[PDB]
């Protein structure tokens, strides 16, 4: 009920990349049931940046995730008080990357505020080169954990040249909601597919498009 | 021809884990296409271990797979001849479980040939305390590179007490097939649900089931 058929969004995103500060904006809209949603970002500071824009995408949304099979809805129940996650994501040529974002509902728009830090991108590395191409999709799995809730996945980064780069994501999610008013999940697993739609003006305006679908495993189980 | 709709197969395994040395053996049978199997594993040597077995479980087969879609078959494209695959799984409490494995096959019998080394398992945590209840279904990622292809994947062991204690694997599968006779595959993905069904002896026997199937992301893309 707060949360409707079709939602808007904004959001603001400050951070720093190999010594590089930056600020980002955005402004969008999706379907929350449908699992689908569109963003308009501008880079306000610091642009138009030395590194890859890419590395940035999965910083800029789970209230629009497709529950599927029934499963309970952990972010969409967090509301209206909202919810915040905290990611460490590792390159596997040595980037780190460390996120902060809380989300939160007001006038009927979702509102995210992010804050970002990378460290050790090698300078020869694609992100540092700009050889990157989008991520191909992934699976992120989901499991109930210390009144929170923990995701991890493994993303490939398409390169020029056609190879990638691998990161892992290691995030935790919180309900700003007491607990008590929280029906938690049981482990399940969220595909996404996150896609670059336009950019001009060397990534200082991106617009990318996500599809997120919530299910279980659905191999047979003997048990 | 050379992998049948039923199919056996042998195992012989040898390692150590926090310096306690030992050997399993295994004889199962599966349904290659169907990618489901069974295996019953013996600890032969170095038995009641002193650990979960279920550290050792991911370590008893690809062969077994249901490819979808068209999905050229690393693994089955491999034989006569055979792969092998060499991997890397980290604990998120510091273990480190390192196997390399050999498959061949003979009589229409597949042979693995198995070898781990575990460190650093913590004296006082659920693996060497043996407060383990078996694996979450996972799923893993795979993409071709240099001539072989790649897996990762983050697995979620189940603990006594309700939470989990995560581990992410590495792997590295190369075919003893030449390369001019294997078609490679794009990137894509394979879900495993591998079931403990029996043990006898505080875990010196083990029976296990796993189903696993490759897919790609059936979510709809924009571009």
Known sequence: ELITE???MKLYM???VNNHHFKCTS???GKPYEGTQTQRIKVVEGGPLPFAFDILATSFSHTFINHTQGIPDFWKQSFPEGFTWERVTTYEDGGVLTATQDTSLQDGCLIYNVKIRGVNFPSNGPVMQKKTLGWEAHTEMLYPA???LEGR?????KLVGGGHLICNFKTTYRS???AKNLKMPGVYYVDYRLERIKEADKET???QHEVAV?????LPSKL
Chains 1, 2 share one sequence.
């Open 153 to 157: 996945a493994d993303l490939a980064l």
């Open 14 to 16: 400050e951070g720093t």
């Open 205 to 207: 305006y991106v617009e």
């Open 176 to 178: 700003k909601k007491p």
């Open 27 to 29: 402004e969008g809209e």
């Open 214 to 218: 919530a299910r279980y495993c659905d």
């Open 6 to 8: 079709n939602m808007h």
């Open 146 to 148: 210390d009144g929170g």
